[PDB]
């Protein structure tokens, strides 16, 4: 009695992440459109460029938060309660958007989700490994099934939430995301008791008595330093929303710069790929709503194409690895990400940017970037959240450059630059 050949505990962790990814991507599939709506009603006083910049820096902070989440669970609270309380905060984040608020609830929702995802995301993957004794062949297979559940929830979420939004408005749609996380917590709590090791109800590497004080000093200096900057920024007048976004961008990018100051192309190639891939929920989401002949279905459903192609490619790629150079899998994967943007430059160049084009352009675009991602994933998970975070931090600046007038050039330059650097890697490798 197994779960696809794996310990039964995988089933609990499978579903738990599926429903968290459901709540997360269901929210993101309509959040940008929700901000557009708040702007159009005059409730939210920002530009569409800023709203899209917020989408990118949001994702950046979510993964940056995931970089330290493992530490807090391993040393302080425990992996199991970290997942639970992380899920609680996430559920609360979606509840906030379900309340009859407008722009006033956005910041609170963002913070709750960032902190919550930071506790849950790295620790649920940690718990997956705990199912396996140290040297097991099943381990690789078990994680792969786990990734499938992640993309499963990411697939059905834009379909369900997006349709719900179209029918019953935004607040109801955000509530379904909250319900999704609630389902995950239910399964996780009761399913976890049956299987999961009681060992991870407590931290596995608890702080030694002499470790507490220097840790306290470290976090206090950082918070004080971060507070000092914000204070200084306000005195000089750099206190607009884009000014804060810039600060977060600088912070997110400074961290790896310093980490290395204390693999470089491999990390850069990862950052650039994730930047392109993460723009599917921002730039491609904008393009879908403005340039696509899609009047017979919710435009938010385009967000399902990314996890759809992942689920479609994985059985094929499972062959390739058994059918027959780690840096080269980054070199080519980045070229495919660049080709996906080059493809998007075509309909605007051929038909102009004023009208509407086929949805098949987006399908082809995602088909290429996911093809790139298939090479990326097989090639320190805290660093995995880091390259992802910087890529999104880069997006927070680049994404603002995108509009109907600049569409063709935007896709062309970043499409070409990505391919070139993929070839630059070919020469270096």
Ligand X SMILES: CCCCCCC/C=C\CCCCCC(=O)OC[C@@H](O)CO
User: Total residues at the site for ligand X (CB under 6 A)?
Assistant: 36
Using CB under 6 A, list all residues that contact ligand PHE: 21, 63, 150, 154, 384-385, 388
215 binds, among ligand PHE, ligand X, ligand 78N, none (CB under 5 to 8 A by kind): ligand 78N
Of the residues 207, 228, 360, 381, which one makes contact with ligand 78N according to CB under 6 A? 207
Query: How far is residue 89's CA from residue 116's CA, in Å, rounded to a whole number?
Result: 5
CA distances from 141 to 1, 375, 429 (A): 16, 17, 29
Footprint of ligand 78N on 210-249 (CB under 6 A): 212, 215-216, 219
176: CB partners within 8 A, 6+ apart: 26, 160, 161, 164
228 is an interface residue for ligand X by CB under 6 A: no
146: closest CA among 284, 20, 282? Answer: 20
8 binds ligand X (CB under 6 A): no
Q: Least distance in Å: CB of 234 to ligand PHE?
A: 33
d(CA 293, CA 416): 27
CA dihedral (272, 276, 277, 279) in degrees, to 10, reads: 130
The listed partner (ligand X, ligand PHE, ligand 78N, none) that binds 369, CB under 5 to 8 Å by sort, is none
Q: 80 touches which of ligand X, ligand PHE, ligand 78N, none (CB within 5 to 8 A by kind)?
A: ligand X
Q: Is the CB of 266 or the CB of 346 nearer to ligand X?
A: 346
**Pick 168 or 219: Cβ nearer ligand 78N:** 219
Q: Annotated binding residue at 60?
A: no
Residue 63 or residue 410: which is nearer to ligand PHE going by CB?
Answer: 63
- Is 66 near ligand X (CB under 6 A)? no
How would you class 192 by CB atoms within 10 Å of its CB: exposed for 0-12, middle for 13-18, buried for 19 or more? buried
Say how many CA atoms lie within 13 Å of 16 toward its Cβ: 30
State which residue, 192 or 280, has the beta carbon closest to ligand X.
Answer: 192
3-state SS class at 244: helix
394 binds, among ligand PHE, ligand X, ligand 78N, none (CB under 5 to 8 A by kind): none
- Among residues 421, 295, 292, the alpha carbon closest in space to that of 366 is found at 292
How far apart CA 231 and CA 110 sit, in angstroms, is: 22
Question: What are φ and ψ of residue 402, in 5° steps?
Answer: -90, 130
Binding of residue 90 to ligand 78N (CB under 6 A):
no
Q: Note the residues at the interface with ligand X (CB under 6 A).
A: 80-81, 84, 185-186, 189, 192-193, 196, 201, 229, 233, 238, 240, 242-243, 246-247, 250-251, 254-255, 258, 343, 346-347, 349-350, 357-358, 360-361, 364, 367-368, 371
Q: Which residues are annotated as a binding site for L-glutamate?
A: 21, 25, 388
């Amino acid at each position: 009695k197994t779960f696809f050949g794996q310990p039964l505990g995988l089933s609990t962790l499978f579903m738990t992440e599926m429903w968290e990814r459901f709540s997360y991507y269901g929210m993101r599939a309509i959040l940008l459109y929700y901000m557009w709506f708040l702007i159009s009603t005059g409730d939210l006083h920002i530009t569409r460029a800023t709203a899209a910049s917020i989408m990118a820096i949001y994702a950046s902070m979510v993964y940056l938060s995931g970089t330290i989440g493992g530490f807090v669970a391993d040393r302080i609270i425990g992996a199991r309660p970290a997942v639970f309380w992380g899920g609680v905060l996430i559920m609360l984040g979606h509840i906030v958007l379900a309340l009859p608020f407008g722009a006033s609830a956005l910041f609170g929702s963002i913070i709750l989700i960032i902190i919550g995802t930071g506790f849950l995301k790295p620790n649920v993957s940690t718990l997956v490994g705990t199912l396996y004794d140290e040297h097991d062949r099943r381990r690789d297979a078990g994680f792969s099934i786990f990734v499938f559940g992640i993309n499963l929830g990411a697939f059905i979420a834009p379909l369900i939430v997006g349709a719900a939004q179209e029918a019953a408005g935004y607040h109801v749609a955000f509530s379904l995301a909250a319900i999704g996380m609630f389902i995950g917590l239910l399964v996780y709590y009761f399913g976890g008791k049956k299987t999961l090791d009681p060992h991870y109800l407590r931290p596995t590497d608890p702080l030694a008595p002499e470790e507490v004080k220097p840790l306290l000093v470290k976090v206090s200096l950082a918070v004080a330093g971060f507070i000092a900057i914000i204070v200084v920024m306000n005195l000089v007048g750099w206190n607009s929303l884009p000014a804060y976004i810039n600060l977060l961008t600088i912070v997110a990018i400074a961290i790896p710069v310093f980490y290395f100051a204390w693999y470089i192309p491999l990390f850069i190639a990862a950052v650039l790929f994730w930047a392109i891939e993460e723009q599917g929920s921002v730039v491609l989401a904008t393009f879908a709503a403005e340039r696509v002949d899609s009047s017979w279905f919710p435009v938010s459903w385009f967000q399902s194409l990314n996890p759809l192609f992942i689920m479609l490619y994985t059985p094929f790629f499972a062959w390739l690895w058994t059918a027959w150079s780690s840096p080269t899998k980054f070199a080519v994967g980045l070229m495919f990400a660049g080709l996906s943007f080059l493809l998007m430059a075509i309909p605007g160049a051929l038909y102009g940017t004023s009208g509407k084009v086929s949805p098949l352009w987006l399908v082809g675009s995602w088909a290429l970037v996911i093809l790139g991602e298939m090479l990326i994933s097989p090639v320190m998970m805290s660093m995995w959240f880091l390259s992802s975070s910087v890529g999104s931090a880069l997006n927070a600046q680049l994404v603002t450059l995108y509009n109907a007038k600049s569409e063709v050039a935007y896709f062309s330059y970043f499409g070409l630059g990505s391919v070139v650097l993929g070839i630059v890697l070919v020469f270096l490798s």
